[PDB]
Design a binder for this molecule. Structure first.
Ligand code: HDD
Ligand code: HDD
Ligand SMILES: [Ca+2]
Ligand SMILES: [Ca+2]
Ligand SMILES: [Ca+2]
Ligand SMILES: [Ca+2]
Lengths: 675, 675
């Protein structure tokens, strides 16, 4: 581990107190064998006090998440655009830690809630820790940090009864969205498949804000951070996500943990869009506005390096729960912009760690420590782990020979604000009029999805808005949707029994942009780690032989195979009782098992066929291997000539066809469209 | 009341700071219109500091839960058995607050996880706050409080990756259960329908421990607390509970909130079993052992009074999240026993509130305050809300005339330890040999369930143990189950492909006890609040007329009716998109809607039929109203002669039959049994 010096080994030895005294911990000290417990039982109290105090406050947002360690490797010397030391040489490696998350749910809510997702990355650089605290969607709901508690209160559970958990599907959230039209862009992303990603590994990361790269000469450029997934993009379908939220609330954290342990650690190209300072207002919107993307057509990506996650934590609480990210963790070569959302975040993340840690020395926790020396005059505070030798911790001093020395642009590789930055004007609590177009980019995004994706987005809105009780809120929602697309407002209105307002075409257009569609991003670049369920039976030795031969051929290509049957035994991983279509990316029935697809105390009535039908309905590749397919496919009402439906006698031919299906990932012709 | 004095109304007025200065909170103060945010923006920082610090640590256990206010009313003057003031007169009323919970899951986890459930009741008595901090299961996993962190660490998520959430279905939990055989009794309860109750209202509450009732003369008797539900007992089936965990993680808190708002606030008879001190060891087990029940046949229940919950909280965080229960909140007339589980609890609950509240003045929060004056020499600490006038807070004093006075058995209605209590022997960390029978009572419990209930319990163990990776742990589990029942171990072993160990009949017997079976507890005594889904269509004016006439007749009898259709409109509550069988206790299809049961952009393929089939498979009353009937029942493969299947042309006859079905609640003949 990068954190090996802090590890504690309990694989041998006798139980001790926290101060090394050998003890026991299984029976209380009592006044007689059936007597009361004694106050002098220090073994009891130290153990129970620790237990009683194990919990800390969950993060105010992004409470539900999971993390891993890895490495970042630079592809080049990037001194031509940034002074940043971690980017200063081809092949230069820096340790990282990444945490992924949802936003709204509390820390035991479901991974597969519909939500924006966090993607937070720490680079433990040789010039200090640098954090990029990003999301899987490139734009944010609001244009000023001061509005964050309004947004978050509205999407979190109603505060009288704390209902509903981890969901925007309630009156307050849609009230906020409909009254605060800045929200439209992020709303459209959340209501697309980007709100229900297949895994953390199958989503991109974005810094959201425009930042600055600063060279050692003082010149600056504007950048956006883009982490492009090397696993490809993929989503769940909503009905699948809902079932998975109940069957496996830990789906995304399990997926990441398993990928790392199998040696399939996920990778991203860490990229930037780079533009000149003079282009802040050149693209038809303001680069200080975090509700806006720069279309790839206007500014192409530059690949800076490779991020790879390849080591799981030892202790979740100590590493994942305690990691404390800050946009204020910045290094020389990077600087902020006057994005009023970013500006306020700088305050929040330093302050909130006091709540979580309960004390000011949270940067001393192993996961938060830097990998280089600390020289400063910060002292004392609860939980102080350092023993400082310098007894003159003030500047300016002569009694410690003027150390530590000041670092700045010209000495000590100091951080420095980009020297060409200026401010001019009144001290104002006013919104820039350059931020006022809330609807054109939502429309750009919607235009850029495929017809079936558009249907899914409409369906997500129909689902959530149908659960809003207030007729006034629902009308207000249609008013805002209508400014993005009259068609969206018409199709959503049909579900909730309202009339859509008349078209208002001020912000309508037909422009599209590349790289935002999931369905459109073509077949996955790899099928390693994807999950194949083989449905078999113990009633036929030949079904288990078919299952074993399929397993060998699928495992050869790095697929994760689960053989399912009525009961466990050698070669069977899971029972029908525990199995669900949400556990697989493709489902194969071996034709020896055909009789299960027409009752048993060992699983719920119809379970084997339900797994197959659910997989088909949710767009997954499905098939029958062995050559006799009719009985299964007729029971399922699955047509044999369907796209992403397979039937072959030959195991080799079956797997070759099926693997193409897995790369296709989803067969979208199985979903009905509005007329 | 301390609650009413601290209520804050924001239905009018201008925004202020926390010190009453009128402000704004929508735009940050900036150095020019596109400039950086200023440090002097106090409006920004106060708002965000508050947001940053909103969270507090969740409870170490029972983190997921919900609460309500109500009243306890005594049925009699109970002076003849206890000095307790809240029980001292017929009709005497005391305010209560109750919180219900699961045990293992974090905040945000699903209500319908399989778990033990908390049932914690605060009586705000005229002689101080009295808490009975109970569960819905009458026995606990362990016999000594010092083991609690062992139990809890084993059932909570594995600490390297924090998987899995809110579940015992993992190796560590079953390792603990198999190595600590005290766990068998509670394990059997949790694996029965008691682990997945239909609602908080449909479960009982238990103090678990033997306590003492103490009279003003100093004599004592041993008691067990039993809160008997007046709503009846009911459970979910596992497959339903899993789906509901995903479709509605807030199911139990919603059910409670809704019942209270409709004027159907839940009721319990608060009862005790009362036995003499001399019977501590008379029933074949030790009354100090919290893994044991007293069979009703050995000691019948005395009804002390009525508990009714009838008012929802105003603010969840302030009331439900902050309520801080303690078994140390005891009143004169009650005393502890030397149960080593109870003994340690007394320490834990005082200590843990320091973690949650962050300071020592947690009893000053309105929900925790008493309803009588506080006179003591406790002073200072963080968050001190009182201004104490007594400037000589020490005893003994003359400078405050010797006040406050000491209270005890003889003066001031003081609490006093039961004066007959003694202790004798060595100071020991040893377990009493009277606690060593871990298996007979698990067997008593199993024997007392119906055949189908026994099958559900076996099925729950087959499900969970099949997910254990370690073959050695699975074998160890069978070893322990085998000591309860060879048949259980045989039936469980069949699912996980192991052999059961040979019968070991040391603890086997055929005794039964009344009142532990859910299936056996007869029809529900009321059907008010139960949920009827009517599946209709907007295609047919006659389908909506059928739905509306059914609605009128069902709503008359206090049922919560939802009409489901493709889209909302007058008379339709929910779309097929958001509807699920988990949302209903009974499902009716109107005849006019027959065509939906043979594709649409408005809901997933087969959703209407799936709701009906799911409802049937999970044992619910189902029917078709209109008198075509055959087409829908044939499509569903639901037999018309089936118990809990209704088929009538007449709406009146349909409802009369259907309502008996709702009282029956579950039709258990639809579940397969081991040979
Ligand atoms: C002014 C308040 C505020 C605003 C405007 C934002 N956030 Fe934030 N964010 C917080 C206040 C905050 C916080 C309260 O300070 C959190 C909670 C825990 C922590 O360490 O910081 C947080 C956590 C947090 C995490 C979890 C980091 C982790 O896994 O531990 C992510 C990924 C983000 N945020 C991402 C964003 C993005 C991409 C934003 C807009 C572009 C954003 N936040 C705006
Ligand atoms: C020695 C530690 C220990 C032991 C043996 C137990 N508990 Fe406990 N219990 C806790 C330590 C604890 C705790 C850590 O102190 C909690 C967490 C939050 C709090 O207020 O106390 C708690 C919370 C808690 C709650 C939630 C209260 C609420 O709604 O806020 C209930 C209902 C119970 N417990 C019930 C039981 C029952 C019926 C037990 C055995 C008969 C039991 N506990 C044993
Ligand atoms: Ca709401
Ligand atoms: Ca999609
Ligand atoms: Ca485990
Ligand atoms: Ca006393």
């Amino acid at each position: 581990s990068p954190l090996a010096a802090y590890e504690v080994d309990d694989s041998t030895g006798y139980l001790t107190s926290d101060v090394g005294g050998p003890i026991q911990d299984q029976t209380s000290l009592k006044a007689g064998i059936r007597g009361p417990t004694l106050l002098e039982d220090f073994m009891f109290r130290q153990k129970i006090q620790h237990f009683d105090h194990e919990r800390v406050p969950e993060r105010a947002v992004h409470a539900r998440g999971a993390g891993a360690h890895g490495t970042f490797t630079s592809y080049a010397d990037w001194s031509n655009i940034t002074a940043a030391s971690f980017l200063n040489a081809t092949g230069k490696q820096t340790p990282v830690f990444v945490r992924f998350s949802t936003v709204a749910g509390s820390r035991g809510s479901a991974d597969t809630a519909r939500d924006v997702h966090g993607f937070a990355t720490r680079f433990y650089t040789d010039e200090g820790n640098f954090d990029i605290v990003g999301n899987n969607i490139p734009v944010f709901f609001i244009q000023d940090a001061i509005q964050f508690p309004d947004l978050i209160h509205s999407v979190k559970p109603r505060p009288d009864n704390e209902i509903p958990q981890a969901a925007t599907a309630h009156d307050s959230a849609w009230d906020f969205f409909s009254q605060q039209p800045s929200t439209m862009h992020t709303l459209f992303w959340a209501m697309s498949g980007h709100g229900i990603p297949r895994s953390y590994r199958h989503m991109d990361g974005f810094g959201v804000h425009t930042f600055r790269f600063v060279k050692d000469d003082g010149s600056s450029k504007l950048i956006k951070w883009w982490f492009k997934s090397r696993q490809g993009k993929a989503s769940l379908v909503w009905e699948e996500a809902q079932v998975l939220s109940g069957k496996n609330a830990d789906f995304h954290r399990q997926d990441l943990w398993d990928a790392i342990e199998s040696g399939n650690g996920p990778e991203w190209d860490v990229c930037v869009q780079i533009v000149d300072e003079s282009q802040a207002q050149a693209f038809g919107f303001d680069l200080l506005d975090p509700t806006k993307i720069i279309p790839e057509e206007y500014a192409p990506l530059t690949k800076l390096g490779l991020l790879k996650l390849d080591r799981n934590p030892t202790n979740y609480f100590a590493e994942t729960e305690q990691v404390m990210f800050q946009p204020g963790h910045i290094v020389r070569g990077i600087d902020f912009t006057e994005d009023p959302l970013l500006q306020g975040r700088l305050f929040s993340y330093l302050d909130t760690q006091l709540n979580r840690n309960g004390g000011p020395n949270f940067e001393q926790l192993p996961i938060n420590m830097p990998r280089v020396p600390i020289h400063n005059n910060n002292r004392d505070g609860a939980g102080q782990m350092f023993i400082h030798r310098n007894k003159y911790p003030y500047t300016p001093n002569t009694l410690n020979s003027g150390y530590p020395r000041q670092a700045n642009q010209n000495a000590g590789r100091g951080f420095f604000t980009a020297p060409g930055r200026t401010a001019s004007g009144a001290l104002v609590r006013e919104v820039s009029p350059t931020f006022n177009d809330h609807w054109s980019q939502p429309r750009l995004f919607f235009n850029s999805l495929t017809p079936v994706e558009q249907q899914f987005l409409v369906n997500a809105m129909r689902f959530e808005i149908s659960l809003v009780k207030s007729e006034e809120v629902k009308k207000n929602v249609l008013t805002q949707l209508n400014r993005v697309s009259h068609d969206v407002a018409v199709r959503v209105a049909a579900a909730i029994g309202l009339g859509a307002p008349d078209a208002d075409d001020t912000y309508y257009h037909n422009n599209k942009t590349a790289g935002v569609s999931i369905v459109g991003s073509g077949p996955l670049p790899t099928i390693k780690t994807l999950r194949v369920g083989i449905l078999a039976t113990t009633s036929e030795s030949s079904a288990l032989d078919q299952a074993a031969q399929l397993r060998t051929r699928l495992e050869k290509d790095g697929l994760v195979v689960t053989v399912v049957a009525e009961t466990l035994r050698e070669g069977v991983d899971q029972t029908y009782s525990t199995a669900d279509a949400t556990g697989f990316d493709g489902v194969v029935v071996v034709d020896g098992a055909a009789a299960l697809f027409a009752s048993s105390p060992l699983f719920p009535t119809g379970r084997p066929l339900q797994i197959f039908v659910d997989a088909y309905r949710w767009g997954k590749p499905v098939g029958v291997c062995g050559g006799k397919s009719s009985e299964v496919l007729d029971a399922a009402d699955v047509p044999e000539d369907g796209d992403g439906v397979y039937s072959e006698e030959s195991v080799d031919m079956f797997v070759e066809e099926f693997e193409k299906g897995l790369a296709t990932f989803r067969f979208t012709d199985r979903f009905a469209l509005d007329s």
